[PDB]
């Protein structure tokens, strides 16, 4: 019976809030409102969140504290035909760790590089600069903030493609190791530590968000940039590709499918109200994005006012924004060295809290399967991380971004989409909503309204399928800048996409064949829930 529980009600929330918050909130949320026509975008973002996004976020968290164990066992004890879903989900989380954790290493490298009176990346006259360089972002030229990030930090110019990684960059190496020594000692013992640690990582950004929020709005052109961000154009309401971006954001940002919320929620008490917790966690997430949206463009306007740069050049998503565009602006304003250290510190604490949930959903998932690795987490992770670290030297290499971008566009991209789809179907159909509700009434004391399951049973699959339909339509081969990825890399990427999903039909096939009796009555064995 007995399973370990959170230190406190807060330690749970903070973990989930921390986990669910990352640079996707910063660098894709602001850019969407901009290109999708401002606050108007918040309509489709709102609807997609309401019907599509949250119901899933709610479902993964409910199962978590109800079935009381890790992703595998949770899908084991629910619909054992589909127990493969548990497997798929976890190795996805396993995969991501080969790349995602690399970001915090860049942040700390910048952070470590931020100690000085005069910032390095403001200048076009340095050794790593080329005649193509300009002091700020310009059409047809390379910003000195970009040329710093590439020719010096990454050394990505020395890579001819993915085939050539080049030398391992060791300044990055010990930076990545520092991240794992942190992620280690955070997860090092139980949720007794990690639950407490998130109080920093899930909070500190909200602090730095503030003093950057004011510092950004005090600048000369800030009143302008906010107009760019929120200035409404309602023609987009009729644009298909707007609901795609919004629906994708709504879905990808909340984070179901990595088996984490399932994992975290497991340490919850059985009767803890997780409906309230689902709604509150969601809100903070979307809010935290909408806020940073204000934080970015106030700094963006200032560059378009004082620094005199075209908007279309500095309005950007992805790592280029936070590692190039933003720091470009900061170096200009007073107290430069201060703003840097808190920004990079914020980026770091933005990654850490998130990564924990992934590593945790892996460990917690296994601890409820293989007992003697529960006896020692304790050097289980030590292998895992050092395994991460050793492979993590691939991304620590000059062609690292090419590697990084590859796992990004492939690993969790279509893998997580189908993985969830079965979670919905298995729960809403195989397991049934009637018994899923009846579970939650025993938990929180009241069953979900006719609204929620309508999202689980119908809306969600129509919603997910809608994303992959327009996901394929807009498909192109993997490319970064002028570099087009070799089709073997593309194929190799689908393996990492397929190795996740392939678990589902694998375990489905295996078990029903590995079950005795009539083929019709060996299925009912796999339809019948563990509790029954």
């Amino acid at each position, epitope marked *: 019976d007995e399973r370990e529980t959170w230190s406190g009600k807060v330690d749970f929330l903070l973990s989930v809030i921390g986990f669910a918050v990352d640079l996707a909130n910063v660098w894709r949320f602001p850019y969407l409102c901009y290109k999708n026509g401002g606050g108007a975008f918040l309509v489709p973002y709102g609807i997609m969140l309401a019907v599509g996004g949250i119901p899933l976020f709610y479902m993964e968290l409910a199962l978590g504290q109800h079935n009381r164990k890790g992703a595998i066992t949770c899908w084991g004890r629910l619909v054992p035909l589909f127990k493969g879903i548990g497997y798929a989900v976890v190795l996805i989380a396993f995969y991501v760790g080969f790349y995602y954790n690399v970001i915090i290493a860049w942040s700390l490298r910048f952070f470590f590089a931020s100690f000085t009176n005069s910032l390095p990346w403001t200048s076009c006259n340095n050794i790593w600069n080329t005649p193509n360089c300009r002091p700020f972002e310009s059409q047809g030229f390379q910003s000195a903030a970009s040329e710093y990030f590439n020719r010096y930090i990454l050394e990505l110019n020395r890579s001819e493609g993915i085939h050539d990684l080049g030398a391992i960059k060791w300044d990055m190496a010990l930076c990545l190791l520092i991240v794992y020594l942190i992620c280690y000692f955070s997860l090092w013992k139980g949720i007794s530590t990690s639950g407490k640690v998130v109080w920093f990582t899930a909070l500190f950004p909200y602090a730095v968000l503030l003093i950057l929020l004011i510092r950004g709005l005090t600048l000369p052109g800030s009143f302008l940039g906010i107009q760019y961000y929120l200035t409404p154009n309602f023609s987009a309401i009729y644009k298909a590709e707007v609901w795609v971006d919004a629906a994708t954001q709504v879905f990808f940002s909340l984070g179901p499918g990595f088996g984490v919320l399932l994992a975290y929620a497991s340490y919850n008490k059985y009767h803890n109200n997780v409906y309230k917790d689902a709604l509150l966690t969601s809100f903070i997430n979307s809010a935290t994005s909408f806020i940073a949206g204000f934080v970015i463009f106030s700094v963006l306007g200032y560059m378009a006012h004082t620094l005199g740069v075209r908007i279309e050049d500095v309005a950007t998503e992805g790592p280029g924004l936070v590692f190039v565009v933003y720091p470009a602006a900061i170096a200009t304003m007073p107290a430069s060295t201060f703003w840097a250290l808190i920004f990079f510190m914020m980026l770091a604490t933005l990654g850490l809290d998130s990564s924990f949930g992934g590593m945790e959903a892996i460990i917690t998932a296994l601890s409820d399967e293989f007992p003697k690795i529960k006896r020692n987490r304790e050097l289980f992770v030590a292998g895992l991380f050092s395994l991460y670290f050793v492979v993590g030297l691939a991304s620590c290499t000059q062609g690292g971004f090419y590697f990084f971008h590859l796992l990004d566009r492939y690993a969790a991209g279509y893998s997580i989409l189908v993985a969830v789809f079965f979670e919905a179907i298995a729960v809403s159909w195989i397991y049934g909503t009637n018994r899923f509700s009846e579970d939650i009434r025993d938990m929180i004391g*009241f069953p979900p309204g006719r609204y929620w399951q309508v999202c689980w049973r119908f809306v969600a699959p129509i919603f997910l399928l809608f994303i992959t339909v327009y996901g394929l339509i807009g498909y192109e081969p993997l490319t970064y800048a002028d570099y087009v990825y070799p089709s073997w890399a593309n194929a190799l990427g689908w393996c990492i996409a397929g190795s996740s999903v392939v678990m589902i039909p694998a375990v489905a096939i295996f078990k029903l064949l590995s079950t005795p009796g009539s083929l019709r009555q060996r299925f009912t064995i796999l339809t019948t829930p563990w509790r029954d």
Partner: antibody
Amino acid sequence: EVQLVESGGGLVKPGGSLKLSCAASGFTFSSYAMSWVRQSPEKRLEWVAEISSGGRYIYYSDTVTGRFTISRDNARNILHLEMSSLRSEDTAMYYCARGEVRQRGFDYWGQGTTLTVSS
Amino acid sequence: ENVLTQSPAIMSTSPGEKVTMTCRASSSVGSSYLHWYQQKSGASPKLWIYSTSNLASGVPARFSGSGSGTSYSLTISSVEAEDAATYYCQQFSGYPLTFGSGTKLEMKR
């Protein structure tokens, strides 16, 4: 509109066994957890047992448990318990009462059915 | 078990007068989980007040309720004779579920 009707019950010799049944009508029965609540001649309401909608979750009183078993037929819309090893302290009027939502209490109550346990 | 004691047990009241009844519990109770039932003589109980404040349907608004923790009260602001009955409170905070001792209203004459 909504009616619940307990049937059965009557005189029973101590140690005897019996149970009654609530006939639910007017609402979708599968979606509401039911509960049995009894009231003695001292006119004091005591809880007996609750059963979930699909009936996978069942809660009993400790003055009862092991002598009482609660059952659910959703197909026919029927709720009945099962009583065995009765006592004279088990004498009361037994109420069929429903609520799904704990936060909302018991929405609708049966007309009651009497039970007298006597030598 | 969480035992709910209700006071006072019998209550004589002249019409229009204000009456209040108290319900006190052995253990702290979730504010929303408490409830109040009205039982007229020779008929099954009725749900009167659910949550703590919230009245049921057909329940005149002259009824109100308040309190938290181990302290709760049902208040009939003004009284008609139609209000003579026995009132019970209940907690869903946990199993086994529990009813108070009951408060019997009887009109003063």
